[PDB]
């Protein structure tokens, strides 16, 4: 009818990942996956969306620390501890204990808490900036009646990731990866008389604002690859097969630096 809520358009697939993900997943396996601990990749950018967007709509999402975890988990290199919403985890462990500290729980479904597995490093970070319209542009020409244009803006988003060694507290590596969100628009409109009094107007439009979350995800995936390279380089998490030191991927991100 008219009163039924709208039917669903597309299939909710997995989040589309850029090349950097299919570039990150295929890394050489290390000796052993490292327990990692990511607490809060906060939103240090201090930028909010301009008009007409609401005043409070943050420019880049507060997503990170939920995208960096996925990045680390994807490459077969890190095992990410939670450490985010850790208070919920500790409440659930409090409840597990208070539920089986009488021994009366059914011998089947009793959860053997070991202890909070603690991580050897900690990947802190930040979104060190989201500048809008770093480089605008756009050409538009319109002959008699027919016209066509174009606009494009770049929003540059930079992300910083620091692998701090939790033992001695010092920082081991720190990488800054940028990404250029591209937001463009195309139109073509016809507004010429075709006959004495038959006005033919028409107009086709299109616009693509690359989503900030996907650009941030690609930036963080590249940041993770750079962390893995800066580690493999000097002292940390050496690979399983040293022959793969010159891997096709570990030479691409080795030369970008």
């Amino acid at each position: 009818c008219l009163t039924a809520p709208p039917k669903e358009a597309a299939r909710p697939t997995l989040m589309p990942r850029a090349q950097s993900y299919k570039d990150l997943t295929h890394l050489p396996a290390p000796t052993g996956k490292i327990f990692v601990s990511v607490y809060n990749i906060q939103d240090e950018t201090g930028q909010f969306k301009p008009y007409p967007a609401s005043n409070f709509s943050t420019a880049v999402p507060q997503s990170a620390t939920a995208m960096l975890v996925t990045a680390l988990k994807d490459s077969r290199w890190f095992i990410p501890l939670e450490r985010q919403g850790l208070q919920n985890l500790l409440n659930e462990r409090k409840i597990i204990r208070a539920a089986q500290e009488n021994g009366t729980v059914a011998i089947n479904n009793r959860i053997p808490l070991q202890s909070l597995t603690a991580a050897n490093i900690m990947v802190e970070g930040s979104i060190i900036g989201y500048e809008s319209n770093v480089k605008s542009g756009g050409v538009g020409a319109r002959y008699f009646g027919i016209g066509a244009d174009t606009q494009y803006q770049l929003d540059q988003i930079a992300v910083n990731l620091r692998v701090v060694n939790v033992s001695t507290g010092e920082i081991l590596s720190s990488v800054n990866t940028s990404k250029t969100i591209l937001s463009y628009e195309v139109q073509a409109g016809v507004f010429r008389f075709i006959d004495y009094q038959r006005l033919l107007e028409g107009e086709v439009g299109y616009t693509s604002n690359e989503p900030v979350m996907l650009c941030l995800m690609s930036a963080i995936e590249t940041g993770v690859i750079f962390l893995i390279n800066d580690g493999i380089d000097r002292g940390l998490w050496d690979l399983q097969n040293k022959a793969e030191r010159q891997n096709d991927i570990l030479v691409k991100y080795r030369h970008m630096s």
Partner: protein, 34 residues
């Protein structure tokens, strides 16, 4: 920022302050008669 696309024509496109020019930009181009 986001490019909230919007037609240029006033009809089927909203922004009405553009109607005075568009049509005038066609009567001035009208090379037809009879």
């Amino acid at each position: 920022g986001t490019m909230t696309f919007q037609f240029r024509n006033p009809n089927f496109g909203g922004n009405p302050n553009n109607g005075a020019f568009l049509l005038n930009s066609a009567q001035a181009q009208n090379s037809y008669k009879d």
